[PDB]
Amino acid sequence: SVVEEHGQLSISNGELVNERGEQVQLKGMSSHGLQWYGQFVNYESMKWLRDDWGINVFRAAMYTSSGGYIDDPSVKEKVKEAVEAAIDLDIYVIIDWHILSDNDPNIYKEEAKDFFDEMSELYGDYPNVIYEIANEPNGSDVTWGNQIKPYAEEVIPIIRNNDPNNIIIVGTGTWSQDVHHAADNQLADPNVMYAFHFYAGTHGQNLRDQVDYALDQGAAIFVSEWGTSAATGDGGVFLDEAQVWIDFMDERNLSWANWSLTHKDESSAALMPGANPTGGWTEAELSPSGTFVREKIRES
Numbered sequence: 001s002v003v004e005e006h007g008q009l010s011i012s013n014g015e016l017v018n019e020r021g022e023q024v025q026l027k028g029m030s031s032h033g034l035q036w037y038g039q040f041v042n043y044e045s046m047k048w049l050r051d052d053w054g055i056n057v058f059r060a061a062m063y064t065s066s067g068g069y070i071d072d073p074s075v076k077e078k079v080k081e082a083v084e085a086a087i088d089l090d091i092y093v094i095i096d097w098h099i100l101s102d103n104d105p106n107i108y109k110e111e112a113k114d115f116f117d118e119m120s121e122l123y124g125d126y127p128n129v130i131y132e133i134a135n136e137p138n139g140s141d142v143t144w145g146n147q148i149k150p151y152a153e154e155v156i157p158i159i160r161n162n163d164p165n166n167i168i169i170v171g172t173g174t175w176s177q178d179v180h181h182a183a184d185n186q187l188a189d190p191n192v193m194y195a196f197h198f199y200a201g202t203h204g205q206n207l208r209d210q211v212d213y214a215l216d217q218g219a220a221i222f223v224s225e226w227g228t229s230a231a232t233g234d235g236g237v238f239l240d241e242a243q244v245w246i247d248f249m250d251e252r253n254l255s256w257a258n259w260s261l262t263h264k265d266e267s268s269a270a271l272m273p274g275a276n277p278t279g280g281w282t283e284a285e286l287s288p289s290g291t292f293v294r295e296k297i298r299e300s
């Protein structure tokens with residue numbers, strides 16, 4: 001129903017819109033690393049998330065390093081499984097080239113170009129797909145102008161040769177927080193968005209003001225990863241600040257994906273240790289984070 005109703009997504013005046021030009025807001029879940037917690041990514045779990053939580057997007061977090069794609073490229077097949085499930089379930093799907101320790105997206109740019117050629121060839125004639133080409137650039141030596149924008153200007157053409165206008169999300173500096181610099185030096189492609197990531201353990205008032213600065217430059221922002229936890233993914237749950245961010249995102253029409261769908265013993269994890277990887281979770285099988293996130297998406 002979601003994809004049939006909204007169809008082809010695009011950016012209009014800095015806003016995500018559907019094929020009739022109306023604003024749309026995606027809310028859903030990210031997987032954790034597919035090399036670690038891929039068992040939670042399947043048609044049945046995604047269907048449960050769609051039906052019981054109300055998700056309209058799912059993010060497939062394919063780590064590149066940390067035992068991910070570069071080390072063992074078999075994980076690309078799990079991305080394909082996720083994309084195919086999203087197609088079958090009529091929801092949107094984010095294909096996330098999940099850089100992190102490999103902090104400069106240029107390190108594996110050749111592999112990224114090949115991977116996005118393949119994905120865009122396979123899936124470029126579906127409206128479901130959103131390409132996220134570099135999760136979290138980070139480090140003081142990785143800047144928008146010198147590293148990230150030129151990387152994007154190599155990968156985006158590869159995608160566009162196969163898929164002229166599905167959305168592309170481009171990471172920003174400082175773990176996808178530095179939307180200020182990106183917004184001042186935007187990419188040419190009209191269907192690009194910049195990633196902004198937050199963690200509710202961080203006091204967020206200035207970060208909200210920076211997102212607003214970026215929006216005021218006409219940049220589109222997708223909050224492709226956020227957590228209820230500290231920036232490590234752990235250390236407590238911070239629901240008061242999470243709610244402030246939830247309300248902010250609704251006011252600004254910002255789409256989002258929560259980190260993450262796993263049973264790992266960390267505060268950002270949505271599931272408790274015994275949760276079935278194919279869905280059907282009772283209240284006792286959701287963590288405090290998962291319970292909150294499910295409520296937010298159901299309310300929506």
Ligand SMILES: O=[N+]([O-])c1ccc(O[C@@H]2O[C@H](CO)[C@@H](O[C@@H]3O[C@H](CO)[C@@H](O)[C@H](O)[C@H]3O)[C@H](O)[C@H]2F)c([N+](=O)[O-])c1
Binds near residue numbers: 066136174227232259
């Ligand atoms: O300082 N920050 O702003 C900041 C922000 C985001 C961020 O990292 C980002 O946000 C979460 C929480 O840190 C990471 O997930 C965590 O990845 C760890 C390393 O794979 C895992 O062990 C852990 O289970 C998992 O929850 C994501 O991969 C990454 F995109 C990191 N980081 O991972 O260091 C730092």
